[PDB]
């Protein structure tokens, strides 16, 4: 439920792009690998609510709306700003990626393989001196655990 505009890049220097308020990046899967860039403020507003969990649809100047997932954000250590973004392009095959957690500490994104059509949004867990393991997750239909069975959350 998110959209963002991406523009192809060929040889413009990434430092030149960043001084213009842009964000260099790449998009790939097992079939394609294309260099892109996005507007920095536009990406930041989406990414704060669409983390590595939610799908971002990229609008290309070629008329293709590709549904992607963020796999990697490379930060500028000094300025605490993103310098590169990796976009994983979704397809018909199942994919492993991190879904959010809903509480009502140890982790904030539990990893499960899932199809793109059954991506869940909420994993509610009910909470002295004890601990909560990942083994106590609800595990809604459509996902398989991609972590160790005894992870503490």
């Amino acid at each position: 439920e998110y959209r963002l505009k991406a523009y192809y890049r060929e040889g413009e220097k990434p430092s030149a792009l960043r001084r213009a308020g842009k964000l260099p990046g790449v998009m790939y899967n097992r079939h394609l690998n294309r260099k892109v860039y996005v507007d920095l403020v536009e990406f930041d507003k989406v990414f704060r609510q669409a983390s590595i969990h939610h799908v971002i649809v990229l609008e290309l100047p070629d008329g293709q709306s590709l549904p992607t997932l963020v796999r990697q954000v490379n930060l500028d250590k000094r300025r605490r700003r993103p310098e590169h973004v990796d976009f994983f392009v979704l397809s018909d095959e199942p994919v492993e990626m991190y879904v959010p957690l809903r509480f009502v500490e140890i982790h904030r994104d539990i990893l499960v393989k899932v199809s793109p059509r059954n991506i869940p949004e909420f994993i509610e867990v009910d909470v002295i001196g004890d601990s909560l393991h990942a083994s106590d997750l609800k595990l809604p239909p459509g996902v398989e655990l991609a972590v160790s069975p005894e992870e503490t959350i």
């Binding site: 990414f47 704060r48 609510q49 983390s51 590595i52 963020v70 990697q72 954000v73 930060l75 250590k77 000094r78 605490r80 993103p82 500490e105 904030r108 994104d109």
Partner: protein
């Protein structure tokens, strides 16, 4: 006061404060962190001064994460001695801190409590700092 329990070597050479931070650059345990903006040797005394200030300001609640440790020995020659005759004696320990390093985190407190406690802690430190809150970028790492 922190210091290593055991050391292979008692004395270390004065290295270099170059480059941005290597590790520990994103909030990982708490909700609000204090981030270094310039390099320095942070002494064990300054670390304890900052920690106690947050403890006092967090009456009852709060959990504090200290993400730096003073492992580097610090050496000083006695007063009124000339140069030479070997390296000086160990007088304390410091943590090498580079820009971008998250030094402290806090959890279990409201936003207002966290900002005031981290602000006071920064006044105990010899470098400029900033207060950050955990975001999507930290979770993406």
């Amino acid at each position: 006061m922190l210091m290593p329990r055991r050391m292979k070597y008692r004395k270390q050479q004065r290295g270099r404060l170059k480059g941005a931070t290597k590790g520990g650059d994103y909030v990982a345990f708490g909700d609000y962190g204090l981030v270094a903006l310039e390099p320095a040797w942070i002494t064990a005394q300054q670390i304890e001064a900052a920690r106690v200030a947050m403890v006092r300001h967090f009456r009852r609640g709060g959990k504090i994460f200290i993400r730096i440790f003073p492992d580097k020995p610090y050496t000083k020659k006695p007063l009124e001695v000339r140069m030479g005759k070997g390296k000086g004696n160990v007088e304390g320990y410091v943590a090498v801190v580079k820009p971008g390093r998250v030094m402290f985190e806090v959890a279990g407190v409201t936003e207002e409590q966290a900002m005031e406690a981290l602000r006071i802690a920064g006044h105990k430190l010899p470098i400029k700092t900033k207060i950050v809150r955990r975001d999507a970028y930290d979770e993406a790492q």
